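Work Package 3 committed the consortium to producing structural models of liganded targets before the mid-term review. Because experimental data for this complex are still outstanding, the team generated a predictive model from sequence and the ligand definition alone, so that downstream docking and mutagenesis planning could proceed in parallel. The input record is reproduced below exactly as it was submitted to the modelling pipeline, together with the SMILES string for adenosine-5'-diphosphate.
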Amino acid sequence: DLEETGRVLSIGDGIARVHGLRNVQAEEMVEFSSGLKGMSLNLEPDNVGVVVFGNDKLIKEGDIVKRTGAIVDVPVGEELLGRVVDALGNAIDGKGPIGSKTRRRVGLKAPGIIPRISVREPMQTGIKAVDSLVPIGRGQRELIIGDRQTGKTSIAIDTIINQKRFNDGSDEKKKLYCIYVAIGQKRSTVAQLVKRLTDADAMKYTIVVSATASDAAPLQYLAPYSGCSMGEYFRDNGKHALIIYDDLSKQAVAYRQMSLLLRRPPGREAYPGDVFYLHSRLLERAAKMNDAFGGGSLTALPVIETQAGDVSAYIPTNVISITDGQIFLETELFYKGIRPAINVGLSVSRVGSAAQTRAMKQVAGTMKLELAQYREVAAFAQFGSDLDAATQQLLSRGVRLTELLKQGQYSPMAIEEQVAVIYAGVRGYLDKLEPSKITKFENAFLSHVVSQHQALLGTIRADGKISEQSDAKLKEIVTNFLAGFE
Amino acid sequence: YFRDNGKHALIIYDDLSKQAVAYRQMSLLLRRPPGREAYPGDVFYLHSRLLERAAKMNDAFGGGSLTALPVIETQAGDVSAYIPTNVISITDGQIFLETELFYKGIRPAINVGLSVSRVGSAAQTRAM
Amino acid sequence: YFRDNGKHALIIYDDLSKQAVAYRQMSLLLRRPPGREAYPGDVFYLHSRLLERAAKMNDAFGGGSLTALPVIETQAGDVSAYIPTNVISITDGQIFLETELFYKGIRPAINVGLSVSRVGSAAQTRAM
Amino acid sequence: AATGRIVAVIGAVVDVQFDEGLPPILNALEVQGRETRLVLEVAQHLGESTVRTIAMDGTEGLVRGQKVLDSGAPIKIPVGPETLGRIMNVIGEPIDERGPIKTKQFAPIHAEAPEFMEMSVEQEILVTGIKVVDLLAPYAKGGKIGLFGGAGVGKTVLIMELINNVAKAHGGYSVFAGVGERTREGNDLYHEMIESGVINLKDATSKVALVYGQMNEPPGARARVALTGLTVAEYFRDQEGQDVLLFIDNIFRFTQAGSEVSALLGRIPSAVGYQPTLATDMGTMQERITTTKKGSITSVQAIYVPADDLTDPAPATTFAHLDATTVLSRAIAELGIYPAVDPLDSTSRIMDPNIVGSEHYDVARGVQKILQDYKSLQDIIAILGMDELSEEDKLTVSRARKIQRFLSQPFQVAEVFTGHMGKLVPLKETIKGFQQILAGEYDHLPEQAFYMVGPIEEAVAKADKLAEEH
Amino acid sequence: ATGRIVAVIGAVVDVQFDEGLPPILNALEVQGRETRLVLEVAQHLGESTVRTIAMDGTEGLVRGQKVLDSGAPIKIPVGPETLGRIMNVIGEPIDERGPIKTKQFAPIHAEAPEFMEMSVEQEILVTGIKVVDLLAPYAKGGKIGLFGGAGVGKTVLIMELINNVAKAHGGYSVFAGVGERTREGNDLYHEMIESGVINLKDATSKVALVYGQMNEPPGARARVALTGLTVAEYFRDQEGQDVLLFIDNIFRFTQAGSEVSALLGRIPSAVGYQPTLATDMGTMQERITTTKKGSITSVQAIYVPADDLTDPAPATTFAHLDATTVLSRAIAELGIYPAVDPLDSTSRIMDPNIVGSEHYDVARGVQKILQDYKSLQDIISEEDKLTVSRARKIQRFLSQPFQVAEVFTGHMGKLVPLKETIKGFQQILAGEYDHLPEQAFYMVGPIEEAVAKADK
Amino acid sequence: GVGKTVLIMELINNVAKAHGGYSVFAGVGERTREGNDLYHEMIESGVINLKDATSKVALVYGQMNEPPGARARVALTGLTVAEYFRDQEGQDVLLFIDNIFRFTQAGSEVSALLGRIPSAVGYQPTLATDMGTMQERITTTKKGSITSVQAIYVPADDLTD
Amino acid sequence: GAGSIREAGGAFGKREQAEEERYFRAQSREQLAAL
Amino acid sequence: STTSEQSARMTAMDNASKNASEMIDKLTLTFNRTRQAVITKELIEIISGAAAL
Ligand SMILES: Nc1ncnc2c1ncn2[C@@H]1O[C@H](COP(=O)(O)OP(=O)(O)OP(=O)(O)O)[C@@H](O)[C@H]1O
Ligand SMILES: Nc1ncnc2c1ncn2[C@@H]1O[C@H](COP(=O)(O)OP(=O)(O)O)[C@@H](O)[C@H]1O
Ligand SMILES: Nc1ncnc2c1ncn2[C@@H]1O[C@H](COP(=O)(O)OP(=O)(O)O)[C@@H](O)[C@H]1O
Ligand SMILES: [Mg+2]
Ligand SMILES: [Mg+2]
Ligand SMILES: [Mg+2]
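The resulting structure, written out as C-alpha cells with the ligand in place, is given here.
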C-alpha cells in the first residue's frame, strides 16, 4: 500500500489547495487523511484545487492527501432498485450495502450520431394533458419548467407511479425503470417522496439518488451524473430507463459555488463559462439506441424552477435550448382550478405524434386543434353570449376539453381510459352537459367503462388504435351512459 | 450624552445616503472589494449600528431617550434601491414624501397610504 | 491635409458605431472599467477628439475647410442611447432617417421635423 | 491550548498566526487582554500557519501581535432547562443581568444535520386559530413554516400572535431566536412574556429560552445567533424528547450577515451581491431545524423579503426549506386586511384532501378559485365598469369581496393597532363560515359585516348592529 | 516541437514548450490518449507557456503530459470525398464509414478574400423556388437569415435548396450543425439519406455534413462553423462552384464564442457577450462571399434571444444578412408549402437596379395585393372582391411541390425558372386568369401547369 | 440637443449684457466652434473690446479636443478667475460654466489609469468629493457675490446617473 | 396577468378601485336599509 | 340612435385597441432596453468585485 500524496497548502469554503500530487489527473478522486473524499478540479502549476466531498472542518493545513488513481465512478445495476443512495452510490436508507457487481464512470460520453434511432415509442406519464398534448417518447429529454409550488414534482411522481402497470406485466419491451435524482432538497421532503413511492409500490423499480441541501456542493453537482450513469446501465443493456433531475437549477447553483470558490472567471449571473457545457453533456446522454445496440433507451425529465416565470434567465435559457420540448406550469392556472396546471399554449414536444399510440393520436389531433381555436377566441369569454353561434360553440367545446384535462394527484390513468375520455370529449358527447359536471361525469363514466367494458379497453390496449368496431362500441357506450347520467 | 443623563434628545441625519456614499468612497480607496452598486458589504451594518443607539431608557438608567429621524433621498421614487431598503428595514416607521402629491398641492407631501409608525397610538396623547 | 492647404475636403465616417464597438473591444481586452453598456469612460473623447478636427479655417490660415458626416446606427430607432447621444453632443446637428418613412416609400426617409442643421442655415444659397 | 497572534484586522475579519497547533476551522478563539470577552471563529486556513477568522464582537482596539488563545472547540453554549427564562447572546453569555446560567452541560453551536433514516413523515395539522392560515395554508405539528414579507407588512405581529396562541397553548419549552432584529422589539417581547407568565423571574417554571443578536451586532454574531438558538432547541429535542417550538426572527439576517463578510474572506461575489456559498450555508443551517424520530421541532421563521421581491436569492432559496409558507403582501395590507396573508401565494404541504378532509380541501380550493376569478374580472371592471357585468359575475365579485374581508381577523396582540378585541376562531368554524359564504347563504348581508370578525355568527351580529344603527 | 501540460482548468489547458512556441491558433495533439484530443492555442502567456482551448474533454489529463505541436491550424480533409459524410470540428469521420480519403487538407483558419478579389456587382442566386426567387431573392454570395423553427418544414426547405442548387447551378452544399442536438442530427442525417441528397452507395451525394454537438466543449462548437466554411471554401476556390453553406444555429456560434471568451478570462461586454463579438462574427462571415472563381451563399438559421431584435447577438448577425426568409406556422396551417411568409421575408437586392425594373415591379405588385388582401380580411365593395380573388390566387400560386418530397406526396418536383416565376405572377396580377378557379394554382410549377390543372 | 447652450446664451444675452460687474465664461469640454462663435459674438456686441481695457468678460476654454487632464482642471481655472474677481475686488461676478458634467467625466477617464477600484456606472470612487471640492469654491461669500449658471449634461437622458 | 391592471396602480387601476367601491357602497346601503 | 352608437362604439374601441397596441410596442422596446441594461450592470458589479481580489 504505497501511495502518492500531497500536502494541504490551504483549506477554506470546501476548497483545498494541495501541494504535490504531481501525477493526479483532472477530475480524479483523492482521499484526505481524515477519510474525506475530494475531486481534483484545478490542476495548477504549483497547487491542485480539490473540492471536498464533505465538511472542511475535518481538513487542516498540512493534512496528507492520497491519490486513488481513478476518475469518479458509481455502482450500477439492478441491485440499486428500491434503494435510496447518495451521490456516490452509498446506501442511506439503512438497508445494508448495495450488492452491485458493476461500476460505471459518472463522466462518460453520450452515444454518437450513429448508435441512435428516432424516438418512436411512447413514454406514458398517466397525465391526460401530457399524454395527449405534450407527448413524451422513450429517448426524449422533456423539460418540466415552472415557478415554485406549481406541480412539477407531482408530474414526475405521477410518471413514476404510472409505470407500475407496465412493470407488473410480462411485456419486457414496455418496462420502464425510474430514477429520481433529488438535488438540494430537504431530507424530509425526500423522505415524504420515498414514502409516497413505497405506498404506491413504486420503489421496487425506482432508484432515488439523494444529494440534499446539507450535502456539500460537489455532491449536489455530481448527483445528476451518478443518476445518469445508473440509468445508462439500463439504456446499454436493452432496457428502458427514465430519469428525473429535481432540479437542475440547484445543480447549477452548486456548480457555480464550486467555480466561484475555485476563482474561475464568472459570467452572466456569476455562472462559469461552461455551465451550458455542464447541462448539455448531462442531457445528451438520454438517447434511444438502435436495435444494433440493444434497442435500449434513457428518457430525461429535467426540472427547472423559474423566478416569476422568467424563462429568459441564464439556466432556463440553457436547458430550454438543450431539451426536446417543455412542459410549462403556471400558478395562475393552478389557482384557477386547472390542475395539473399545464400551459398548453406554451408547452411543446418536438417529438410529437411520433411518440403517441394511434388511438391517442386519433383523439389528440382533434383535441389539440379544438383547444387551439379555443385559445384563439378565449379572450371573448365574458362576452360570449354576444357573438356568433360558431364562437359560442368554440368557447363551449374549449371549456369542456379544459375541464376534461384536470386530474387528481397520484392517480395516473391508463392510456385506454385516457383515449376513451378524450373520445367522449372531442366527439361532442359533452356539449349538452354543463361544465360544472364534466369532471364528475369523467369520474362516473370512467368507473362504468372500467367495470362493465373491460373488453373494449383491452382491445384498444392490444390494438393501440380505435378500429371501426372499437369506434362504434365506444360510441354506443358513451351515448348510453350519457343518456342515463344524472 | 443627553440620553444617559435623564434628558431627551432628538437627532436628524440629513442625510444617510450621502454618508453611505462617503463610506463607499472611503472603502473603495482602501481597496476593500465592492458589493452592490460598489457599496461595501457592510453598509447595512454602517447604518444599523448607528440607528440602534436611539433608545428609550428605563427609570433605573435615568429614563432619558434619543429619537432618531434619519433622512433618505431616493432616485425617481425607487424605494427598492439598496440603501433605502436597508434603512427601511432598520427603522420603526417611515414618512413617505412624494412628488406627485407635492405638486397636487398636498404640502407636506406625506403619502399616508405608505407612511407607517410601528409604535402607533402608544406614542400619542389621548385627545389626539 | 486639404483643410490646412487652402482646399476643401468632405469626410464620411461609415460608421462611428462600429468604431465605438471596436474601441470597446480593445478597452475590455485591456481590462479597463466598463461603463454604460460596457463602454469605456473615454468613449466620448474617442469621437470628440476626432470630430473636432473638422473645421473651417479663416483666411489667415488658408481658408480651407473639412466637413464631416459621421454615420451612427441606432437600435429600434433609439436615439437616446449612449453613443448616439455622445455624437449628438459632438456634432452640429443631425439628419434623422426613420424606418417608418423608409418602409412607406418616402425616400430619402428624412424625418424633417427632427433633422436640424445648427450652423448650415447661414450657408444656404440665396435662391434656395 | 495553542496561542497565536493577531496579524491583520480588516473590518470584522481578523487574521491570526499560530506557531504551534493551528486550530481547526469553526473553532472559537479568545482574544487576550480585552475588557469583555471577544471570540473569533476560524473560517479559513490561509497557509503559512495563518487562519482567517470572523469576529463575534467589535474589532475596535485590537492590536497586531495581540495574543489569541485556542479553546479547542467551536462556540460552546450552555444547554439545559436552566436556559429557560434567560436571555443569552451568540456566545452563550447571559445578557439579562440575572447572573450566570448554571447548566450542567454545554453544546457546540456547530453540529451535523440529522441523517435521512432519522426523518419522520408524520403530518398533523396544527390549528393556530387564525382564519386564513388554517383555511388555505395550515401549519403542521413538527413542520417548518416560514413567514415571508417585505418591510412593514406584519411579520412580527403575526409571529407574536403565533407565540401568544400556540406557546400559551403549548407545553414543550418554546425557544425564541432574535437574529439581527430591533432591540426595542426584543425588550418588548421579553416584557410581554414576563407579564404573560411564560417567563417567570421567580419559582423557575419558565417555558421559553431567549437568544438574541440584534442589528447592532457585527456580521459574525448575526450569522451565528441563529445557530445558537438552534442549538438550544436541539438540546431540548434530543436529550429530552420534548416537542419544541422554535421561533426565529428574522432568518434573512442570517443570510445577510454572511454577505457582509463574504468579500472580506476573499470570495468572488455571486448574483445580486450574495456570497457564493448562499445555498449551502442556508442548507447546513436549516437542515438541523427538523423533526427527527427522537423529538419534534415546530419552527416558525420570519423571512424578510427585500423590496417585496420574492425572487431575491435569499427568499427564493428559503422557499424550498419550508413545509407551509405564509406570504404577506403589501397590496393586501394597503386594503386594510390583516393579517396581510396572500391567499393565492401561500402554500402548505398538508393542503391535501387525504390529510385535512375533503370538505376542508374543497372549501379552500373554492376560496382560492373565486379569488382568482375576482382577479380576472377586475380588468373587465376597469374597462367596462361595474354596471355592464353579467349577473353571475356581479355575484362572483360580491362573494369574493366578502371572502376577502372574512379572511381578515382581529389579533390579540394588535389590540393597540385596531382597538378591537382578539378572536381565536376554531377550525370547524372557519370551514363552516367560508362554506356558507361560498354557498350564497349571506348574499343579503353587506361586505363590511365580515371585516375584522371571528366566526360567522359575529358577522351576522355585526351586520344586525350596522343596520340597527343606520 | 514537443511541450508538456502545465495546467488543466476545465476546458483550458496551459502547455509549456521548452523550444519553438507554436503560433496562436495552432493545433496541438495531446499524446497518450485513447481518443484524439486537440488543443487550439489562444494566447502566449510568457515564459514559454501557451494557453489553449480544448476541442474535447480534458478529464484524465496529467501535468507534464506530452503535447505535440502540429505546425498548422486545425487541418481538415477537403474535397469531393467529404460529400455525403459527417465530420466533426477536427475533420474526423463520425458516421462510422471509415476514413475520409481526400488528397488535400486545408486549415480551418484562413483570411477573407482580398479587396481586389471581390465581385463588384451584386447578382441573384436563382433557387428555383417561386416565393424566394420573387419576393425575397438570394444574392449570390450573400447571407440569408432563416427564421422559424420547428413544424414549418425547415428541413424540407434546406434539402430542397441543396437539391435545386446542385441541379441548376451545379454547386455542392455544406451543412454546419453548430451546437447540434445529437437526436436532431441523427434525424437530419436520415432525412437527407431518404430524400436522396446523401447517397451511401455511389458518389452522387450533394451535401457534406459537419456536426459539432451540444455535449462538446465551447471551443469545438466555436470552430465547427469554420470547419464547414473551410469545406465550402475548397468547393469554391478549387472547383469554381457556387457553394451553399447552411449554418444551424448561428446564435449557438455566438454562444460558443461567448463561453470560450469567458473561459479565457476576458471581461464580458454588454448582456454578457464576448468583447470580440463583432470581430468573431466578422472573421467568420467575411469568408462567405463571391470571389473571381466561385461564390459561397450562406443560409443561417437565426435564433433571437427573448424575442428582442436589439440583443447583441441578433443585432450583430443582422449587419451581415443580405436576405431574410421567415417560415411562418400561420402559412403552414393554410396548407401552403413552403411556409415562407410572403410579407415578412425581405431581401436587400429587391431593388430595381439589381433585379431589374420588371422583376421589382412584379414583386411590389404581389406584395401590395397581399397587404390589400389582409387589410380586407380585417373587416370580413366593387373591386375589393377582385383583389380578394386575385390575392387568393397569388397565395395559392406561391406554394410549390418540392422534389425531395416526391416519395411522400407522390407529386413531381418543380424547379421553376426565374423568368417563368415573373411571368406567371405578372399574368395573375394583370388579370389574365380570373376565370380559372383558385384551387388550380395550388402546388404547381409554372403558370402553364395552373391552366392545365384548371382544364381538369 | 435639448437646449442647454441656447438657454445659457439667452441668459448671457439677458443677464450678462446689462450686468453691472464682471463675468467669466468657462468652456469645459464643449465645441470649439461654439467658443469661436461666443468670442466673435462678444466682440461684435462690444462686450469684449480688443482696443482698450473696457472688456467685461474673461474666457477660459478647455474643449472636447483636449485630453482629460485639461478638461478636469479648466473648470478650476475659471473658478480661480472668478474667485479673484470676487475676493480681491468685492465685485459681483457672473460665472457661466458649460459643460460642468465634462469635469466629472474627465475624472472618470483618469480614474481607471490612476489605479482606483471603479464605483457605480464605472465612475471614479471620488466623484462626490471631487465635485464638492470644486463646487464649494463656486459660492457667494460676504466679501463678494458670484451668480453661477452651469450647464449639466445628462448622459443618455438618465437623470439618476 | 389576471389582476395586472390594478396591480400596476396608475389611473386605470385607481379608477377600477373607485368604481368597485362606489358600486358596493351603494349595494351596502341598499342592503342595510333592507334589514 | 342605435346604429349610431353601435358604430361609434365600434370605432371608439378600435381606436382604443390601436392606441393600446402602440403603447405596448413602445413599452416592449423600453423593457428590452432595461433588461439588457440590468444584465450588464449585474455583470459589471460581479467583474468589479472579482477584480478587487
Ligand atoms: N394535480 C394536482 N391536483 C391537486 N393538487 C396538486 C396537483 N399537483 C400538485 N398539487 C399540489 O400543488 C402543491 C405543489 O405541487 P409540487 O410540490 O409537486 O410542485 P413543485 O414545483 O415541485 O414545488 P416546490 O417548489 O416545492 O419544488 C402540492 O401541495 C401538491 O399537493
Ligand atoms: N395583524 C395586524 N393588525 C393591525 N395592524 C398590523 C398588523 N400587522 C401589522 N400591522 C401594522 O403594520 C405595521 C408593521 O408591523 P410589523 O410586525 O413590524 O411588520 P414587519 O415585521 O414585517 O416589519 C405595524 O406597526 C402595524 O401598524
Ligand atoms: N429655445 C430654442 N428655440 C428653438 N430651438 C431650440 C431652442 N433650444 C434648442 N433648440 C433646438 O435644439 C438644438 C440644440 O441646441 P443646443 O442648446 O446647442 O443643444 P445642447 O443641449 O447640447 O446644448 C438647437 O440647435 C435648436 O435647433
Ligand atoms: Mg418539487
Ligand atoms: Mg419585524
Ligand atoms: Mg451645449
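Reviewers should note the following from the model. Residues F 4-5, 30, 98 surround magnesium ion (ligand 6) (CB under 6 Å). These observations will guide the Year 2 experiments.
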